[PDB]
Design a binder for this molecule. Structure first.
Ligand code: CL
Ligand code: CL
Length: 159
């Protein structure tokens, strides 16, 4: 199991524009675009071609690669995230990247209390704290998966 496999399971694959769990235009593997026209535009600009709203698997994967790379770099550039990331083992690092991919560096950065818990390796507590969020309430199955990953340090929730 790895980050790519982990996110591909959390986000699914869609070759046709679509609306996200919160109604935003998205495509491929959780590639957030945002108006459909505005979204079509963004999409065209992301792909460099006239897409008419549809992409190939290859195209979705290209975006996905760019996006995982971007999440990692953001983490590493972030003064609040980097120290947490540095203190973690490989599996849990994957869990942090997943959250970033989904909510953005900023969104994750604001889980201040949880972060401190993670940094201090208080597993059970951080799992409980992480659960007290809109994120958990809005996409509970996904959230439960990431949280179990932080709590156990294993890939059991994905297997
Ligand atoms: Cl892009
Ligand atoms: Cl979910």
């Amino acid at each position: 199991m790895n980050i790519f496999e982990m996110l591909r399971i959390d986000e699914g694959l869609r070759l046709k524009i679509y609306k996200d769990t919160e109604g935003y235009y998205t495509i491929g593997i959780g590639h957030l675009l945002t108006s459909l026209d505005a979204a079509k535009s963004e999409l065209d600009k992301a792909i460099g071609r006239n897409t008419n709203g549809v992409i190939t698997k290859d195209e979705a994967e290209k975006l996905f690669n760019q996006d995982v790379d971007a999440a990692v770099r953001g983490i590493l550039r972030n003064a609040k995230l980097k120290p947490v990331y540095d203190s973690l083992d490989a599996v849990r690092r994957a869990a942090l990247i997943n959250m970033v991919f989904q909510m953005g560096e900023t969104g994750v950065a604001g889980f201040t209390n949880s972060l401190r818990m993670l940094q201090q390796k208080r597993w059970d507590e951080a799992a409980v704290n992480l659960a007290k969020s809109r994120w958990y309430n809005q996409t509970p199955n996904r959230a439960k998966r990431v949280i179990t990953t932080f709590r156990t340090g294993t890939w059991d929730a994905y297997k």
